[PDB]
Amino acid sequence: EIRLTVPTEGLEVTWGNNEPYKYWPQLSTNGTAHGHPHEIILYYYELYPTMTVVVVSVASFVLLSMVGVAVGMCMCARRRCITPYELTPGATVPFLLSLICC
Amino acid sequence: YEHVTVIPNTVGVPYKTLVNRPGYSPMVLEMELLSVTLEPTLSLDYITCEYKTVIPSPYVKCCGTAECKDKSLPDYSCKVFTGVYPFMWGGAYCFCDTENTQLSEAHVEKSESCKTEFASAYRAHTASASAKLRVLYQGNNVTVSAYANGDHAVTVKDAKFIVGPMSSAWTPFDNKIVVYKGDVYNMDYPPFGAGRPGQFGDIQSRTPESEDVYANTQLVLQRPSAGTVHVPYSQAPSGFKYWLKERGASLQHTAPFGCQIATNPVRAMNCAVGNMPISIDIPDAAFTRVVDAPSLTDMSCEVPACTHSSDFGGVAIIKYAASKKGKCAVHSMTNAVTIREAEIEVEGNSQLQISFSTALASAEFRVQVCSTQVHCAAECHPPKDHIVNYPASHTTLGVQDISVTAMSWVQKITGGVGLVVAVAALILIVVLCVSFSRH
Ligand SMILES: *[C@@H]1O[C@H](CO[C@@H]2O[C@@H](C)[C@@H](O)[C@@H](O)[C@@H]2O)[C@@H](O[C@@H]2O[C@H](CO)[C@@H](O[C@@H]3O[C@H](CO)[C@@H](O)[C@H](O)[C@@H]3O)[C@H](O)[C@H]2NC(C)=O)[C@H](O)[C@H]1NC(C)=O
Ligand SMILES: *[C@@H]1O[C@H](CO)[C@@H](O[C@@H]2O[C@H](CO)[C@@H](O[C@H]3O[C@H](CO)[C@@H](O)[C@H](O)[C@@H]3O)[C@H](O)[C@H]2NC(C)=O)[C@H](O)[C@H]1NC(C)=O
Structure with a gap:
């Protein structure tokens, strides 16, 4: 019993003196498009196991990075709007600033 | 009306192209490649085959010393063995006991089988392309055999089809090609006159009919056993026979892109490589106005x-x-x-x-x-x-x-x-x- 892997371009198999057999893969999946997010990833993962992982890994990395940037900008804005108050000898912080930033 | 389209160089897969000539009803042509052939230009360098070693009856000089002459034969050796005392079925060959010499000589030449069993070492160059195309034209199936070098127009119901040149120059054949029968190998064969014993090319000839033979078999004459007249030798066995056993898979089975290989002539067929442009010239008579x-x-x-x-x-x-x-x-x-x-x-x-x-x-x-x-x-x-x-x-x-x-x-x-x-x-x-x- 021999298990042969079939490339997307197809596989040719010759058995003895018989004419060669040719095989091509189908785009079969257990996941599905038009389903839940995890079913969609499974669909594309099964069809394109390396392209899908690279796209998902990179997209996830970038999206998380952009969130980190949004937070970093918020913290920068926070320090800039608060500092001028903390340096005041009789500093009093407006409620909205106290609630929103502090 | 001249229409230019490009189809993938695949076989058994139909492609459809739209012929759009404004004011006239559109035509759709279905084109399928049935066969694509690349036929390389070949230049024979030499052929190889099994050699035979020719050993003329030994000369036994009794009560005297023999001597031998040099010869121009492809791989020639002669040696005189002293102190020989050979026997025949009826007794000792000659009168003297120790004062005898035997002259052994041998040469290598192409066997009679070389007319049928041989391998040809070719230099491969560019290839001429040709293809068999099925065209569905106005509802009819027409099969046209034409060259695919871009220089051949073949008529399909008064439409002219020009095929090629192919966009890929790739060929399964390397510069050095060895052909046995139906099997073609990409073997880096040695230059003529540079063969080696026990290896392919140990015996070489420019053409099947040529008497000009190069051989390197390391044929060494040995001393005969006592009391006998046989001529022993040590020689590297034909590299042709060894090659036949050690050939391995031919290009028909190893080639990339699913190429099929055939000989007589040498051909690479149905290689799934690149694409192939087609130019179609359709006469105005073949067009129907949109109003009709x-x-x-x-x-x-x-x-x-x-x-x-x-x-x-x-x-x-x-x-x-x-x-x-x-x-x-x-x-x-x-x-x-x-x-x-x-x-x-x-x-x-x-x-x-x-x-x-x-x-x-x-x-x-x-x-x-x-x-x-x-x-x-x-x-x-x-x-x-x-x-x-x-x-x-x-x-x-x-x-x-x-x-x-x-x-x-x-x-x-x-x-x-x-x-x-x-x-x-x-x-x-x-x-x-x-x-x-x-x-
Ligand atoms: C133009 O030609 C195509 C392709 O067929 C070609 O021409 C035929 C006359 C034969 O010489 C073929 O060897 C050659 O490739 C025609 O399309 C093909 O039609 C045949 C039926 O005539 C289809 O075969 C059927 O397939 C089904 C499903 O497997 C079977 O159940 C049937 O019993 C029968 O085998 C064949 O699949 C089909 N091929 C394609 C790609 O569609 C086309 O009809 C023909 N047009 C005209 C006007 O002649
Ligand atoms: C979708 O899920 C299917 C199972 O729910 C799966 O089919 C099963 O796949 C396994 C391999 O992962 C096959 O191999 C197993 O079973 C055989 C006996 O049938 C054993 O000899 C093996 O050692 C192993 O345990 C199953 O045979 C196969 N079963 C069926 C009914 O197909 C599909 O492959 C999944 N589809 C995709 C795209 O992943």
């Missing part, structure tokens, strides 16, 4: 089923109102979707059925029938079968070719993060503006 042709209006497309399988698993039903009875061309407006039918028969107020193949998870495409376009859309499902015995009738997908719901999820997630960034950016800009406003 059937015209469709009030068209609407519905797709009751879709499977993105290699075969034509998709079906679409299109409603139409035909101005008159007649045949009508059908064309896909997207490369992602292949339609099986080139033409349909339509009349009155009815619906037409077409089959299609796509790799798309979500099939979004337009179909042009008698210059009238419709928009089709479907959710396609995967096949349960994992393997088929035929190539896909559809093209591959790009990175942008994703399902509708996948695109929606991407937009929701991308927009969600983009919104958070846009808000954070706005807050920072506002704070900085306030910081700049203050002194």
